[PDB]
Each structure stands twice: as structure tokens, then as C-alpha cells.
Symmetry: D5
Subunit: 195 residues, 10 copies
Amino acid sequence: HLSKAKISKPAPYWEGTAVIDGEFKELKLTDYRGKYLVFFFYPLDFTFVCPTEIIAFGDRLEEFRSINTEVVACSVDSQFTHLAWINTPRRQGGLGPIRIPLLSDLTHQISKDYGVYLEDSGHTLRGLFIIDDKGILRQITLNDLPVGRSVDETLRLVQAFQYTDKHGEVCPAGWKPGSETIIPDPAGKLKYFDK
Amino acid sequence: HLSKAKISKPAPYWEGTAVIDGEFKELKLTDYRGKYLVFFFYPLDFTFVCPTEIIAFGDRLEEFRSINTEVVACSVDSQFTHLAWINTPRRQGGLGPIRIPLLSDLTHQISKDYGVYLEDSGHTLRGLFIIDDKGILRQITLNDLPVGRSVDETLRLVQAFQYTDKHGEVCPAGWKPGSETIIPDPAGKLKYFDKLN
Amino acid sequence: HLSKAKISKPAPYWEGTAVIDGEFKELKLTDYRGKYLVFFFYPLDFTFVCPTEIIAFGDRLEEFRSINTEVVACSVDSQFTHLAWINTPRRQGGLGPIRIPLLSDLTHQISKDYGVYLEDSGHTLRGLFIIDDKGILRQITLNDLPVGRSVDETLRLVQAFQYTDKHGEVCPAGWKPGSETIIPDPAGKLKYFDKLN
Amino acid sequence: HLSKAKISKPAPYWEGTAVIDGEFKELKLTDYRGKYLVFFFYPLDFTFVCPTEIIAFGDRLEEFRSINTEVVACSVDSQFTHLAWINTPRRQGGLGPIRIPLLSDLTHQISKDYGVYLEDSGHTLRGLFIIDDKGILRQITLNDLPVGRSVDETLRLVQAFQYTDKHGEVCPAGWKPGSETIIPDPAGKLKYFDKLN
Amino acid sequence: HLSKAKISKPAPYWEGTAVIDGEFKELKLTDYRGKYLVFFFYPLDFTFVCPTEIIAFGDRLEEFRSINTEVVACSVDSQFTHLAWINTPRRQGGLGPIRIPLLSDLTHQISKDYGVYLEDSGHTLRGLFIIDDKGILRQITLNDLPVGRSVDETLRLVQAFQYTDKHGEVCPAGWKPGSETIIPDPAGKLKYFDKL
Amino acid sequence: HLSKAKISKPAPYWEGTAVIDGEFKELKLTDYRGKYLVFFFYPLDFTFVCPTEIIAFGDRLEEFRSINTEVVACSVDSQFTHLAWINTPRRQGGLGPIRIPLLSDLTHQISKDYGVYLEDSGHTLRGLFIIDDKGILRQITLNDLPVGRSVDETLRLVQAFQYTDKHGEVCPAGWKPGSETIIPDPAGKLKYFDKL
Amino acid sequence: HLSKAKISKPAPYWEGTAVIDGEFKELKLTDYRGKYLVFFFYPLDFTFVCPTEIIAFGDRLEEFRSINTEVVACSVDSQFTHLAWINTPRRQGGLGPIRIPLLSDLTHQISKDYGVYLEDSGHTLRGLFIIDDKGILRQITLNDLPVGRSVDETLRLVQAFQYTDKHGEVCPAGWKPGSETIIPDPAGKLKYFDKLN
Amino acid sequence: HLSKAKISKPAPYWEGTAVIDGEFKELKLTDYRGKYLVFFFYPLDFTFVCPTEIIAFGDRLEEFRSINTEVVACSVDSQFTHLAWINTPRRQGGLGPIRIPLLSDLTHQISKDYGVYLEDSGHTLRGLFIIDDKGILRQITLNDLPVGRSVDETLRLVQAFQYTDKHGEVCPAGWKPGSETIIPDPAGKLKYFDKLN
Amino acid sequence: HLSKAKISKPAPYWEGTAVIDGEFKELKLTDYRGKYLVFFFYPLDFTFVCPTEIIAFGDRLEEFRSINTEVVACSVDSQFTHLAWINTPRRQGGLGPIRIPLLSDLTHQISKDYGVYLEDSGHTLRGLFIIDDKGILRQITLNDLPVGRSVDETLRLVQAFQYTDKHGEVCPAGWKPGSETIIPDPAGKLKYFDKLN
Amino acid sequence: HLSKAKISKPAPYWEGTAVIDGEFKELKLTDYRGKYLVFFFYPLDFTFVCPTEIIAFGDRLEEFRSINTEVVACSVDSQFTHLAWINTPRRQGGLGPIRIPLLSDLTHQISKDYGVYLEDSGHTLRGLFIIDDKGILRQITLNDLPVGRSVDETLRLVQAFQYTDKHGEVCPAGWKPGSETIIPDPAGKLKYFDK
């Protein structure tokens, strides 16, 4: 069972049970059409780096929502475990209440489709996916277990993709809103380089 | 031909011709054992985001070298096109001199091994790989063509992996040097979680 | 991936991480050779019938050890969730402290091997296995999700199997310690059948 | 040839000649639509544990019939042997008259479909199946040869499935009619978990 | 899974549990090396034609032992049913004591090997095999269910195969002991034919 | 290429050239629908046991026709050799006139279909098949080369299968016409068994 | 099963029972090493063209023997039929006594090896093979059923092969002993082509 | 690529370029339907036995046409070589002018189809085929390289086959026009066999 | 992936991006129907023999255009490297402007279809193909890396094919315009052969 | 059966009967080791363009031999036909006496190995192969039937290959003896281009 997640192709469809606002809801990748989606996997509820990533994104949710972007998290844990984890205080490595959905992937189908499943561990690695508003996969970020991701970098990439989507210029190494872009032409490119 | 790049497994072996100091040289992945390696692919010489990335990493090379970390760039272009591109003025979208080896992957064997090859286009997408000193692959970052990568993010990641290798505590979201880390134990973890709250 | 659990054959080998007295230990089926083992799967941590079954056995564990018999429970949940569930008070549907190992089957290998994995639910059903001191599988009890198992019936079966192992009499329907047994040959059997009629 | 018996799926269709009320009739799994059915295999006519199990269920048939539940027994023996066994006095290890059908499975098709056939022995083990009124398989109980089953556990199980069928609450470990049940919901579950602790 | 019973080749090996004088014994085809063996399958214990055949053979078993020939019957029934059948009075379609072993073929392995197993019925047809002292299969008789075999015919055939084994002549149609044989030579055959 | 002869299934179809009253005729198995058919193979024209069997059956052919039963013999020999064999005096191992058709199986198709062909020898063994009026194969008798079959036994078996076909009872071991049959019921079987 | 008979290659080995001098003997292709052999198949004993061909070769056997050449005839008929045919008077279409072996091919192995077997008919066609003293196949002649072969053509062919064997010149169309031959060489060929034109 | 030439079946279809009266014409086997055809292969243009065979037939062609029979010769040589060979004087081993089509089989398809191609020589052996007016193959004559064929024998066979086609008598060994024939049935045959004895 | 280029069959179809007049354009083989096409591959931009060939054909383009003949060059380099190479001064081993389309074969699909791809090197060898106005492939010229091709030879070939298309006489070795040609007939050919000697 | 003839690999081995100096001789590709070999196929003896190519090379044989180069010709015709053709006067499209060997390839194995065989015609196309002294295939020239090859071009290519073999410079489009070569270096190349 190989990864179906290929950049510049539709992101692999998924659906399953998620904990949303303390309740079980059916959630589908297509529920997010028309918005950008940061879709990210994390290894395991009641672990270490994992809660910090969920909380980091959750507490900065408006920086995504103010740019038409949603955030969904997923692990192979069941929805009952997700809820228990939510009802655990941050002070003991719980999430506490949380505004981002927690998708459950007990069958591992979603993790396999995204190519983030670890056959030897029975869970996911640190895999984040940026999916545009048309449902096209744009960016893949995969981290080995011990190192957490970055909300700032994720943010920069969403903003870059939204900008190239809109203007049809391209973003140089390190681009942040306000930085110089490049006209992708053998001639038009000289505006950027010459100066 | 399937991707051989798997995180927490040895980075797929490669070897090819690269332009190093304006000279053709045989370069292999194993030349970098003992150091962390930032190995990254870019689509095409004489294009747009690509030179900016090479230059970004190039100009800030000491920040990697001082953390025992090398950088190698690669594309499907020949060593001859690479050299021409090096000998092209930065103001004309060239690179000017550069201390970063430019690997050539004309046969596409390396790109395919790293899963970055674009069958419909005949070149790679923007794929960066962080390999440690033991040659294990630790991080994969894959960008669609129009968006460039970040040197800062890459540095942070290298430092993060280097920290966790040394200490065995794990790095929280957003970790930078000087940040709080976590003891990966159900009791030990409370030192981090009780503190922050 | 088909079931390897067959009555009168060696029980399918298993190994993995379990929570034993609050800690993560590696646990092998072969650690129980010499003893009878009641090895049972339950669907999901933090659910409903499951904690009642785990507790029902745990609280009656002495009744099993005093007859050279151990109990192990397993679900597809991680070791970390098992521990959170143990550190959850019974009033909230947690297990509280518990003397039965909670084995973790995150990869589903073990559940598949025992034929109890529900492919489209992503967890197991209520499967219990009685394994003798020689590692041979003697009894399989499979329950649909909504109906819990019985410690009493499990005890009776362990007693019966230990008995038939020792004596080479066979145990009639409903046998409990103390009841009549049959000598399993065409002549001897009459001592049983003639008695009760 | 692989087992077709899966819990929560339609029980594998069967049909065959059975001894009923002293006569050979054709019987079908579908003849039991609408009622719960306890369908069970025993190894061999004219053996030891087998007659005790048949007689146990048969002498207590009303405890099943008065809960809309029938009982069918099956072995690989022919219908003619079934009848000869019926015509053998209980004192000699026979069955005497019996009110439950004895299904015949000479071809082994049925046993193989239920996964109870023992390829080395040429007969089944002690396999019992509880099948609901809607034809769905709910519980599988399998015993190695020396240990007989329990009519009382079977009763408790039938009672339990009927209960959950009707009330959509779930039955804890050891449930007997009149025992506490659980609302299968992370909220309504506490109703049970505060009461009992 | 197909028949391995081939005339003039070794009879397919078998082993199984048999009832021998009300006892459970392991029986092997190779236990019979050195003697001829009538080896026959019958459909079902506690039926109709089957017991008559078993008895017909048992009552006359002596005629076979005094020509160095054993007899063994087999069905798909268990040894337990076999024994119960023996412990049933003849007047009730039982066998009463019987000196022929009753072999049990619960797995059907043996029936399938001898090509006598009926897939649709789960038991054998009426198949009988004559096996010489060297273990070579010499004769095959298969009857549909309704019709019983004949001990006399079976005796005649054993006598026949034993004759040709020794004298190196051949037995014409109808041959009983004392009947005229034929020398299997284009010339020698004339003694037989000029007679008639 | 394996046998298609299965008791209680339709006998495998055959057609071939046969000598019928010194003439070459096309014969089909389906020509016999409506009558019982003894259909038997013998090894080789101009040999020893083969002619005795053919004659034994031909001389007594009447006993078969007066119970609606035909007989047909077959070997791998050509029709020409068949005819020459008929035109050889009995005193020389010939058949002289014969009323049984002699079917020719030069291709071996028919023998292979009836599972009677010997790969090492290039001819059949002594295989005989009883086929009812409905075309269903009821009996199979196979003898190794040296030993001739029996017309009497063959008659008994035909009589047997015709009886059970009509009366719906079954024939015990040794059954000749006029012998006691059995009603195939767990109760009805007692008339037969209480007698003895 | 495919024909193994190829010109200029060893004739396919055969062996079988033959009628020789009124008796059954085993005969082998290798028994003819050292001599030329005319090996020929005919359809059927007691037919029409067949006896004429056997009798033709047999009555003229010395014309072959006095040139170190034997003759063997074969059909799919048994040895017993062969003998009965020998014992049939020529006037009745029999062979009468014969001095050439009649090989028997009941299994059809030999005919099939020589490629002469007719699958639709169950016998061979009129196939004749000339095999040299060294065992090599030199000439193949095959006739449909209605037309007999020629003893004289066969003689001419044997004579011709013997000649070329010995002198290493080649035999033109129609060669009979005493006729012009040709030196097989672009130079020495003219010796023949100037003479004859 | 196996031989398709079988006696009593349609002769394998062929077509190709031939030299006919000095010109290149396309020629099909089917152009001879209605007539008998002697179709023969010879090894190589400008060799030895080959021109003698071609000439032997050519010079006697009337003897074949006056019996509704054509002759065609074929080799693996090109049409251009055939023509050069025809325009070569007989004294030099050429054919001189010739009324028999020389068919060309450069691709070897035809030779392979007739089973006469020598895989390791790259040309055919001396294979002659008699095909009737219905396109059925009646006679195959295959000669090793060094020995030429016989026009006389070929004529006798054509006469014999035409005869048996017309009359339904069969032709004994050695038959020529005028000789005795056999009526092919067990009674009629005696008129032949009794006569000559 | 096998070569599809077969002389006297339609040239394998291609289509890709090419630099035409300093601008990226979609070019297909079918754009050249109605004209003869000289389609040729060269190894690598920014190398040695390669620019000399492109320039040679480039500078002498009118000699082709006047004979209804186009020239397209191709390599595995991207259109971006092509354009850079065009914009490189001829004295620095560049091309300067050029009226010959430079096709790009990054995916290698075109090279492989034409059998010119070097698997071990990741580029083509020097392969030139002459395709006529009906799109049929007429000539293939393949050079090892170190030796350049010839414009004169190519022109001669085009003219040769154009002449024979018009006239149907064939071109002798060394034929140039104004040379003697041959009528491809065994008699007609003598006009050429008798004249020259 | 696919072509084994690949540039810069050993030329496919061949052996067979050839007409040499009016006689039949066994000839092998290896008999030519240590010399360059122009090995060329032609369609058919007694045809049209074919004799002109054979004669063209034969009458200019010394221009090859004076540079350590041999020439062999091959068709699918037999050796007997080759000889007949040789013994045909040039005036009637024969070869007359000839100093280059005529290889026969009746089995088509050699033509197939060289990928010049025409499955539909049962003969070869106009295929010429330049094989170096080490036995390595260097150049392939294939012509459709109606157009003959060039001795001058063949000559130029032999000379070019011999020159690059010797000096390790490379030959530009159109190179003839005496013309400028190029040093195959990103820097050394400028000697040629700059001037």
C-alpha cells in the first residue's frame, strides 16, 4: 500500500470520525473545499512533542483563519482517546479544550494514503500537508519523531502559496509577505535579479 | 521506480558528477559521513526560485559549517550547464561563484531514488533532505515549484536534530536554541508540562 | 492476513510493549510457558464494556494465580493510552491501578494473528483465548462488541482443561470441580453413563 | 477451504438432512429466521462429552424456547448413525429420544464453512454459534475435545444479546438479566461508572 | 484430488484406526504384504446393503483364509460408530461379532485415494479391490449404491489371480478352479481351442 | 488425459466404427438409449482370454436381450482386424460368426475416456461397464490381463440394477432374482433382518 | 507430441516387439548399426495397398541384402495381428510367410516420433525412411493412403546415398548406378556441365 | 516456427515473387486450384544437383501439363539471382531458358511453412510436394542434399493419385498406368489378391 | 523502452518545447509534413562538437530551405538552458542567434523513441535522421560522441532522396546532382552499366 | 531478435563464408583486430545501387589500406551467388574481379545482430558500420534502398575517429584532415571558439 500523496495532484481523499468541540463528528477532506487546509499527522495522544504541536497551532488558529485557512490534526488513536486527551489538563501533557478537529485513523488507511504510516511502530511520523482551496496538494513536510514542526514556517508557506496563486509571480528563498517576488520569464526575471 | 527515501532509515546512496569550485568532481553521499548533510534538489538551472535558494544557502554557508553541517544542491541539468550557470552574473539570474557543490543528475537516477522526480516535466520539484552524521534521513521537505524554501527553518531543524541527538530530550513545536525541551517519559514529561502552565 | 489461531496447535507467537505496574515492559507469549494463560483482546481504551471486563478479571486475579494461571489483556491502543486509562479513576470509566498487563497492538499484527481484528473498525472484537502451560491453544471465545465476557465461565474452563490434562477423564457439559467425569473409552464410559441413570 | 463464519455478518448458510422427531427431514439455516438459534457442532456420535452436551441442551430446551430461541446440533456423522444413537439408552451412552434436531454433515461442507473441522481427525471440535433472529452471527465459542460446554453460559449469552438488541445499552462483564447495563456514550457512560464506584 | 488406484501397480498405501475384535487397532496396508487382500469400501454403518455384504464376507471368511487371503472392510464412519454397530444385534441391522476388521476413513483420504468417495454424498460407493501378496492391485469392482456385491464372484477372482500367478497360464471367461486354462502362446493356445 | 467414467453419472459418450454382422457400421453410445448396455473392452484381437469372453457373451447373448440389455465389445484393433478375427474359425482362436458388435478404438480416445487404456501396453485392460437405459453408468468391473470376466456375474448385476430401478428396494450381497430384498428405511429394514 | 525425424540427424531411436521368422522378438533401431536400413510404416494389417508393399519389399529382399541394406516394416497393429496376417494366404489378402520383420507400435510412440501418425484415423500413413549405416536419417518419403510406394525408387535412393557416402561426388536428378555424377565445387562442377551440354 | 505441411490437409498457403518467362510476377498457391501441382524446393542457385533437377523437370514439363499438372520450383535465393541463373548457359551450370516458375523465398517463410528450411545452413533441403487440384497435400518427398530426385517417380505418383481420385480403386506397390488395382473393401479386394495368386 | 525509428516506416511522432527565435514554442513532428525534415540530436548544451554542428547547419540553412527542407535540433537540455546557450557569444562556445529550432527532451521520451538515448550518460549520442515530406524515415546517421557530422553529406543525401522520389531511378554510390542514375530493372539497368564501362 | 549493434560497445561478433580472391574462406570479425574496419551490408547481388557501392569502395581500397583500414561487404546472398556475381562483367551489373571480401549471411543471423535485416523483404537495407581497431563500434550509417552511400564521407569518418583516438581532441562539423579540432574542456575549448 503506497503513498497516494503527490505534490500538484489532488490530495488523497479522506473521511473519518473526529472530535470537534468535544463531540464526535464525521469529517471529510472535501468539507474543506474553497479554503486552504493545513492537514497534519502526529504520532500519538498522551505523548510529548505531539501536544505541543497541536496546542501551538490551536492557540494561533486565527492567523490561519484570517487568511481563509483551516487546520486539521490526525493520529491513529481512536476518538475516545482523543476526547480523553482533550479532557486532560495541559499541565499534565493533555490538550485541554481545543479549537482544531482531531481526526481518528484507527484503520491506518488515511495514514497509508498519505504515506506517513510507520509499519514498525503502528503509528504515524510527523507529517504535515498543505492543501490549497482547489484541493491540490502543494507542500509536504515530514519530520522524524523527536523534532516538532513550526507554525511560523507553516504560515509563511500558506502565505506564499496564496500569493503565487493570486499574482502568478514566484517566491524566492525565505519569502515573507512584503518581500520581492520574481516574474517567471527568461526576460521578466531580470527585474528581480538586476537590482 | 519507487522512492527509497524513508525517514529513520539510511538516506538512499547516490554518487555523481558535481561542479565544486568551478571544477568537475566525483561526489558521493558517503563523503559526508561524520557530518549532518543538507541535500536538496531544485528544478532547473537558469530559472527563477532556484538560483535564490542556492544563493540563500550559499551566502549563509558558515552557519551550517560551524554546526558540522554541509550543503549539497542537485538538479537534472548537466555539469556543463551548471558551470555555465555559475559563470553567469547574479544580476542576470546566474549564481556567481558558490561554495556549494552542484550535483548533476542527468540520468535521473538520484531524483527517482529520492522520490522528487517529476515524470511529466523531466525535472524535480523542490525537495530538501536532512541527513545526519550517521547517514540516517531525518527530515523531508517537499515544495511545489512556485514556492522557495527557508534557510532559517532548515537551520532550526538541523539544530533541533543535533540537540535531540546529544540530549535525548525531544523538541517542542517551534523549538529554537535556548527553548524548553521535553523528557520523553510519562512522569519525566511533567517537568516540561507543569512548568509551562 | 489470515488467522493463525488453531485449537490444539501452538498459540500464535506474540510480543510487544505492555504496561506492567505502571511501566512499559516488553512482553512475550513465551514468558508464560509453564503456566496457563488467559489471553484476551478488548476493542478500545476509554470505552464501555471494556473497562468492566478488564476490572472483572483484575479484581479476581488471585483466583487465577492460585491455579497457576495468568491473565493478559490486549487492545490496538498505544502503551501511552493504556497508562492514561490506568491513571483514570474508575468513576470516570478508567481502570484505576491494575495487576493485569495491558499489551499494546498498534500495528495490528497480534490481533490479525489471532483472527480478532475488525478490518473496517480498526480495532478488535471481544476475543479470549485459553492457552495451556505447553503453549497450546485450548479454547477460543469470541463475542460481538456489545456483550461482555464471564470470569466464571473462564475459570470453569481453565479448571476443566487443567483437570483433563492431569487425569485423562473428560469433562461433561457443565462440569465444575467436584462433578462427575467420563473415562473416554467405549467400556469405561459406562461407569459414568450407568451411574446417572 | 476457509472459514466463512464471521461475527456481525450473516452466518454461513447451511442445509442438510437432520434427524427430527425420529425422522429424516431436510433442515436449513433459513428455517430459523425470526428466532435466535444456538447452532452447535460436536465431534462424534457414540463418544463421551458429546452425548452429555446434547442431552444437557435437550433436557433444558424450554429455557431456550421460552426466549424465542431454538437449538440445533451437528456432527460429521450420518443421519443413520444419529438415529441409531437416539435409539441407544442413555445408560449405554446413547441419547435416548431427543427434541433437538441432529444435523448431519457427511461432506464436511458445513463444518468447514463454520471453521470447526479438524483436518487431522476427520471430525469437528466443540464449536458453538449464537445466531440472531436476523441471521447475524453474534458469538463463537470453541472448545478443544476434552472439555464440554455450558448450557448456562449459553443462556446468559443469548439473554444478553437479546437485551442489547432491544435496548441498545451494552452488557458488562458477567451481566445476568437484572444486572446494570451501560449507555454506550462518553457522556451517558458515567451514569454507570459513578453508580458502581 | 484424484484416484491412485491403478491395476498392475502397487495399491495405494493406507493406514487408519480399525476395530479388531471389539478393539481399536492401527491397521496398515503393509501389514498385509505376503497375503492376498480383499479390501472393500461400503457406504454407511447402520444402513441396508452394507451389513449384508459385511456379514456375507465374515461368515465365509474361512474360504478366504484357507487360500491365504485376508479381508478388510472400510467406511467413512468413526471407529466408535463401527464398534456400536458391532454391538448391535444382527436382527436389528447390526453385525454382531465380526472377524473382519472395520477400518475407519473419517478424513476421506483413503476413499479419495481409492477413487471411491462420492463428493455429493460424503461417503463411498460399493468399491472392492483385490490386492495380491506383492501389494499389486489386480482387480477393481465398483457398484452403485443399491446393488450388493457377491462373495462367490470375489472368491472366483482371487482363485483366478492366484492360479495365473503360479502356473503362468491364463483363465478364460467363467473360470472356476478345475476349469481349462490357456497357454498364452500363438501356438500353445491351440490345445485349448481345438478341444472345443 | 483422464477417465470420465463415473458411477451414477452419464456414461461418457462414444462413437466409432464397428463390425456388425460382417459389416462396417457407425455405432454410437446414444444408439442404446432405452436399453441397458453391457459395454466392455478387451485387450487384443487374436489373443487368448479375449475370444473366450467375447464368445461366452455372444453364445448367451439371448439371456441379455430377453431382459432388454444389449452387449458391445471394444478393443484398440482396427475394424479390418476385427472382421478378419470373425472370419477365423473358433478352433484357431477366432470368433466365427458373432452377434455382438465389435467396436474399434484405434485412436484410444474411447479407452482413455473409460479409463481402461494401458499407457505402457498400447491396449486396454479387461474393463466392463453396465449402463442403464437412461444412459447412466451403474457398474464398473476391471480385471488385470490374465483373468477373464464372468457372464453369470454380469447377468446378476444387470438383473439387480433393473430390480432396484423398478421396485425401489435394494439388493443384499449375493442377490439373484427371487432373493429377499430390503426396504431402505430405518424401520422397513426390519422385515428383512428379523427374518434371519 | 512432435515429430523427431530430421534429415541429416540421427534417426529417432525405436524399440519394440516384432514378428520375425514367425516369432515375437524385441527389435531395436540400433540393431541395424553398420547397415543401411529401409524403415517403413504402413497403415493397417488386413487392408489393401499395405500387403502389396510388404510383399513387394519382401519378395525382393536380396536386392537390398546384397547392398548391405535391411528392411523393417511397422504398423500400429499388435504383434498377434501381425502373425495372424502372416498366417493368412496371399490369395485372401494375407502376407503368407515373410522374411522382413514386422514391428508393432501399439502405443503410437514410434509413429509419433517419426511424424507419420494420423491423429484422426488412429494409424499411420505410408511413410518410408532411409537410414544410413551410421544411423543418420537421409530420405523421407510420405504417401497419402491410396497410393503405394515403389521398391525401385527406394533401391535407386539407397544406391545413390551409398555412392555419395563413398565418393563424395553428388548425384543428379534421375541418377542410376553408372550415371554421371558431379564434383560439388564451383570449379570441378564444369567437368559435368561441359560434358552434358 | 513449425511445419504446417500435412498429408490429407490443405497445403500451406504461399505467395511471393517468381521469375516467369524472364519477368518478375507475383505467384500464389491458389493460382493452381483446379490443377495438380508439383511444388518443389531446391537448396541453392548456382550449385550442383539443383540445376539438374530444375532442368530435368523443365525439359519434361509437357509430360506434366498433358495430365493437368503444373510444376513450380522454389529456393531461398532472390528473384534477381534466379534470373541471373536463367541467363547463365547450361554449360556453366546455369539453367538457360526455362518454363518452370522459379519462386523466391528470401524471408524463409515458405520453406519454414513446408518444414524444409535448414536452420543452420540458411537454405532448404530437397523437398518436393504433390498437391492435388483441390489444394490438398498428397505426397511429401524429402531428400538429403547430395541426392537428386526423380521425374519418373514423380510422374508415377501424380498418375497414381489422379487415378485413385477418379476411380476409388487403390494403387498397389509399384503401380504404373496399366497395372492391377485393388478395390478397397474386405470382399472386393479378393478380386485383386486371388488374381495374382 | 525500445527504438521506434525504422527506415521506410513513419518516423516516430514527437512533440515538445523548443526555442524558436528566442521564444518557447510547442513544436510537433507533424508540423513538417509537406517538407523533408533533417531532425538531429546532439549530446549536451555548452559542450564542444555540438555547437559546431548546430552552427554548421544554421549558417547553411538556405541550402536546405531552397530544397523544401527544414532542420530541427534536439537535446535532453531544458528550453531554459537552450535559451541561455543561444544568448551566449559564439566566441565563448555559445551559439549566438540561430534560425534552427532547439527542441528540449527533458523527459528523454523523444531520445528513447529515436534509439539515441545513452542510459549510462543521461544524454544522446550524435543521431541524425532524414525524414521525407510524407513523414517517412529515410536515413539514419549515428555518430560516437567525439566526431561531428557533415552538412555536405546531409545535403547530398536529401538531394539523393528527392531525386529518386521524383524520378524512380536509383542513386549510385557517391551520387551528386548531375550524376548518372540507374533504372532499377534487370534490362533497364544496362543503360547505366554499359555506359560507364 | 533485436539489434546488438550499439555505438561505443564491442561490435557484435560475426563469422561466415566469404568469397575472397575468387575462393571460399571462413571469415571472422576478430580477424580484423588491430585494424579499423568498414563493415557494410548491401541488399542483393545482381541488383542496382549495390554493385556501385561495392565497386566504389573496391576501386578506392588503398585510401583505406594506407590508413590501416579494411573493408568488408555482406549480403544475405549465398557464396555461390557472390562468386557468380564476381564472374559477371561490370558492363552488365556484375562486379568483375574485386579486392574486398564478400561475406554471405544466408541465415540472416549477422544482419539481425546488426539490426539491418528487413523482415518483410528477406534482405538487408544499406547499412554501414565503422568499427575501430579495438573492435568497438563507432559509427552507424543506414540508408533506405534507393540511395547509395559515400566513400568520401566514410573516409572522412574513419580519419576523424583515428584522429580523436590518437590526440584526444574532438572533430567539429565537417572536419577533414588538417581542419581545426577542439579541446574538450570548459576552459580549453576557448582556443577553438575565440579565434
